[PDB]
Amino acid sequence: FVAGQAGPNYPAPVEAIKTIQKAANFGRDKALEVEAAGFAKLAKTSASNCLIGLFLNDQELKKKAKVYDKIAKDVKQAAVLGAGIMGGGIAYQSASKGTPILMKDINEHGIEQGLAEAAKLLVGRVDKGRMTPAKMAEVLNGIRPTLSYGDFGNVDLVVEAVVENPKVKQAVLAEVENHVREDAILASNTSTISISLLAKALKRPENFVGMHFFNPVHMMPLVEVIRGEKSSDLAVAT
Amino acid sequence: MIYEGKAITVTALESGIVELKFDLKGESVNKFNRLTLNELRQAVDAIKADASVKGVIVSSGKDVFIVGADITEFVENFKLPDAELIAGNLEANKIFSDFEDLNVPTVAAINGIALGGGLEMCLAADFRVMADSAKIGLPEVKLGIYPGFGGTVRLPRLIGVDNAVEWIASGKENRAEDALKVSAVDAVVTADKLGAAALDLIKRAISGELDYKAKRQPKLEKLKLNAIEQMMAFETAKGFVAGQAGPNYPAPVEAIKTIQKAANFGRDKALEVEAAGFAKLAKTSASNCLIGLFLNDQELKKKAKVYDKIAKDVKQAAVLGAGIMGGGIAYQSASKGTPILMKDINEHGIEQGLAEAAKLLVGRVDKGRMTPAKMAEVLNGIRPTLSYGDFGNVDLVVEAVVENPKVKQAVLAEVENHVREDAILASNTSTISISLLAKALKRPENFVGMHFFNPVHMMPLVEVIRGEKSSDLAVATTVAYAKKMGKNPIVVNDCPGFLVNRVLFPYFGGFAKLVSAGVDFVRIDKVMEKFGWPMGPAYLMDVVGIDTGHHGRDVMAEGFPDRMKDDRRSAIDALYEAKRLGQKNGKGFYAYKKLVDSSVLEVLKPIVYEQRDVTDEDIINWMMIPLCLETVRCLEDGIVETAAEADMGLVYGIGFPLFRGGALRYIDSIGVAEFVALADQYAELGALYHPTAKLREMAKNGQSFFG
Ligand SMILES: CC(=O)SCCNC(=O)CCNC(=O)[C@H](O)C(C)(C)COP(=O)(O)OP(=O)(O)OC[C@H]1O[C@@H](n2cnc3c(N)ncnc32)[C@H](O)[C@@H]1OP(=O)(O)O
Ligand SMILES: NC(=O)c1ccc[n+]([C@@H]2O[C@H](COP(=O)([O-])OP(=O)(O)OC[C@H]3O[C@@H](n4cnc5c(N)ncnc54)[C@H](O)[C@@H]3O)[C@@H](O)[C@H]2O)c1
C-alpha cells in the first residue's frame, strides 16, 4: 500500500515498515536496534537531507514573512473582477478562508458561472462529510455577486481577473481605481502582461501590484506577488 | 370497435386482448360523472358479453389517468336523501365490482394522476403498471369524506391495514417509488414503455404464467390479520389519527372504524360498511363546509387567470431591510426560483438576514428534505447589498423597513430614483395607509401593498393592498409574484387593518369585554380552541405580543371610532402597563412553555368590572359575533370584492377553522336570519354587535352569502 502511494523516491515510509516487520519478535532493546539501524541509513540518503532542505527553506520564508506583516495592512473586504474560471476560484478561496469578497462582472451570465463553481466545491466537501452545511453557508454568504461598484466603498484589496488583454485590463483597472479608497491595493492576476506596464494606466501605481494565481485557484499552493516598478513595499506586504 | 362512447372506447387488440381507454371527448381530463360511469357500465357489459375477449387493459388517452369529478356534482349528490345516495353509490360500485369479477385478466395502465375514483378504478383491476412520473392517492378526507367506490375495501387488502389507513387518513398523493414499495402498483416503467409493459404483463397473465385469479382473491375475502393484530393495529390507528386530526374532523377516524368493522367480511359486506359511513359523513356540517372551501378556491383560481392576463412576471426582485421580515421575504423569493437583492443600511442588518436564510435551508437539508445543491441555488439567489447599483433591472421592490410613516415615505421615495419607471414598488406595512405612503412617490400608479405575515415562511396569506392610485397592472404583478412564492394572495383595498387584522381586533375586543366581565381567560380560549381555532384568544395575544396588540389597538381606534374605541381600560392596558409583553417577554396572559401563573390575576384585577356569569355558548358568541359582523362590513364597504375572497382571507391568514368554512360561511351555516337575531341578543354589548342594515335585509329576503 504505502509504496504504491508514496513512490520509489521516498524510502522513509517503506523503511519504517521494514523496521517494524523485522523487530516483530524482539523485545525493547533489540527492537530499538532495528530502529536506529535504518534511521542511521536514512539520515544520510539524498532524499532526507533534501527534504530537510525544503524545511530549512520554509524557515527563511517565514523569517521573511514576519518582516512583511510589520507593515502589511490586513484585508477585511476583498473584491475580484470577473467571475467564472479564475473568478469563482479567487472568490471561493477568499471566502473559504474567512475573507468576504465581491464578485463583480458585466453580465449576469458571468456571475452565474462563478456562483456555479463555488457550489460544486463547497457541495463536494460537505457531500463527503469533510465540510459542515453550516460552514458552507458562511462561505456562500461570504461571496457577494454584483455588476456595479456601489459596495466597493470599503474594499481593501481588489484582484482583477478580467480577460488577458492589455487594452482591456488597462481600462478596467483604471475604472475601478475611481470607486475605491486611494489607499486600496489593486492586484492583477495577469500572466502574460507586464504589471509595470498596466500600472502606467493608473493614477496611483504605488498601490498597484500583481497577484498571480494558478489554475485551478483552489489546488495551486503558489501565488506570485509581482512587484511592479512602482509597487510600494506596503502594496506588496498587504 | 367493441364499444365506442364519448368518454370510453373499448378497442380490440392482438391475441384477443382488448384495451379499454378513458378519453373524455371535449374536456381536458378524466372524471367519474354520470356519463363516464354509465358508459363504463356499458363498456363492461360489452366485454362480459363478448365471448372472444381473453384479456382486458385499462388505459387513458389524456395527460392524467382519472382525476376526481367536478366538486359541483359532489355538492349535488350529497344533497340527496340518504336512501337515494346509498342507492346511487351501490349501483356505481357494482360497475367496478363487475369489472373486478371479469373472468379475464385485467391490468390498469396508470399513465398519470389517479385520484379518488381514478385510483378506486385501478384498485378494481387485477394487476397495475404505473408510469415513473405518475401519482396516485385518495384525497377524500379533504372533502370531509372517505373513499366511496370500494376504496376502504380494496386498499387495506392490497397494501395492508396500517398503510391503507396511512394513505386514506392523509389523502396524500403518493409517488411511483413509494407506490411500489407498499405494493399498490405491481410494476413501474417509463412513460414511453408503459403501453408495452402492460400489454406484455397481460399476455403472461393469459398464458397462465401469472395466477391473476389468485392475485384478485385477496380483496374478496376477510383481512389477513389475526384477531389480536386487528385490535392492535386498529386501536392504535384510531388513537394516533384522532390525536392529530382533532375531534372536529370525523372523516379520518370514521375511515378507520369502517375498516375495523368490515375486518372479517368479503367484498360486498365490506362495501356496505363503506357506504354506511360515507352516507353519514356527506351529511355532516364538516363536509359541506370543507367542500365550501374548495368551491371558494375555484373562484380564487378563476379570478387568478384574469390577473395573469396582464401581470408582468418578476425575474428580479428586491427587498429593503434584512432581519426578521427581510430574511423571510428574501428566503421565500429565492426558495421559489426568483433572485432578490437584500438591501440594508448597515452590515449587521444584512448579517441578520443571511443568518435566518441559513437556519431554514440548513434545517431542510439537515433532515434530508433538501439537497445541499438545492441549498446552493437558494443562497446564491439571495444577494446582499448596501447600495442601489444593481437595482437597474429590478422588476418589483418590496419595502420591509421600520414601521414608521416618515421613514417609509423617505425610503420608497428614494428607491423610486434607482429603478425603472415601470417597476412596481410594494410596502409590507401593517399599520400605515398605503394610499398615504403613495402620496410621497412620483409614480403612485406603480405603488401597491404586499403584506406578509410573520413568520414569512409559514403564513400562506399575502394581502395585496390596492392603494387608491394602484393600477390593475401594479396589482396583477404583485399577486402573481406572491403566488409564485408559494403563497396564496388576496387583493384588499387600502383601509386601517386591511382585512385580516381589521377582522381580528373586534375578535379581540370581544375577548377584552369577556375578561373585563370577570371571565377566566384560561376558560375562554379553552373553549375557542375546542371551537376550532389553533390558538385561543389569550394565548394568541402572547404570541403577537401585548406590546404589539396595544399599538394595533390605538390604530384601529383612530380608524373606526364609531365602534372600535373603548373608554375603559381593557385587560390589554393592564398587561401592557404592567410590562407583560407576552411570549416574547416570557410573561403576558400566560407565563413562559405555556404555563398559568396567579401573578396575572392581580394585574387584571383592576379591569374586572362586573362579575357577570356566562355560559360556554355565550363566550363563543361574545367572540364570533363581532368577528363575523366585521367580516361582513369589510365586504359591504367593498374592502374585498367577493365573499369567497374575504372568507379565504381568514382561512389563510387568521387560521379560521376549516370545518366551519369561514366567517361568512359561518353565518350561512347558522342562518343569516338566525344570526341577526342571535346578534341582537348581545346588542347591549356595543356597536360592535350591531348588525348592518344591509344584513338585516338579506336576512329577510332569505338571501345567503354562498347559498
Ligand atoms: C393579530 C395580528 O396582528 S396578526 C398575526 C397572525 N398570526 C396568527 O394568526 C397565528 C399563526 N397562525 C397559525 O399558525 C395557524 O395555525 C395557520 C395560519 C397556519 C392556520 O392555517 P391553515 O388552516 O393550516 O391553512 P390550510 O393550509 O389548512 O388551508 C386549507 C387547505 O388545506 C386543505 N386541507 C383541509 N383539510 C386537510 C387535511 N386533513 N389534510 C390535508 N389538507 C387538508 C384544504 O383542502 C385547503 O387546500 P386548498 O386551498 O387547496 O383547497
Ligand atoms: N488558462 C487559464 O485557465 C489561466 C491560467 C492562469 C491565469 N489565467 C488568468 O485568468 C484571467 C482570465 O480569466 P478567465 O479564465 O475567467 O477568462 P474567461 O474568458 O474564461 O472569462 C472572462 C470573464 O471576465 C468577465 N469580464 C470581461 N470583461 C470584463 C469587465 N470589463 N469587467 C468585469 N468582468 C469582465 C467576463 O464576463 C467573463 O466572466 C487572465 O488574466 C489569465 O491570465 C488563466
Ligand SMILES: NC(=O)c1ccc[n+]([C@@H]2O[C@H](COP(=O)([O-])OP(=O)(O)OC[C@H]3O[C@@H](n4cnc5c(N)ncnc54)[C@H](O)[C@@H]3O)[C@@H](O)[C@H]2O)c1
Ligand atoms: N411584529 C412583527 O414581527 C411583524 C408582523 C407583521 C408585519 N411586520 C412588518 O415588518 C416590518 C418590520 O420589519 P422587521 O420586523 O424586520 O423590523 P426590525 O426592527 O426587526 O428590523 C429592521 C430592519 O430594517 C433595516 N432598515 C432600517 N431602515 C432601513 C433603510 N432605510 N433601508 C434599508 N434597510 C433598513 C434594519 O437595518 C433592519 O435590518 C414592518 O413593516 C412591520 O409592519 C412585522
Ligand SMILES: [Zn+2]
Ligand atoms: Zn395604553
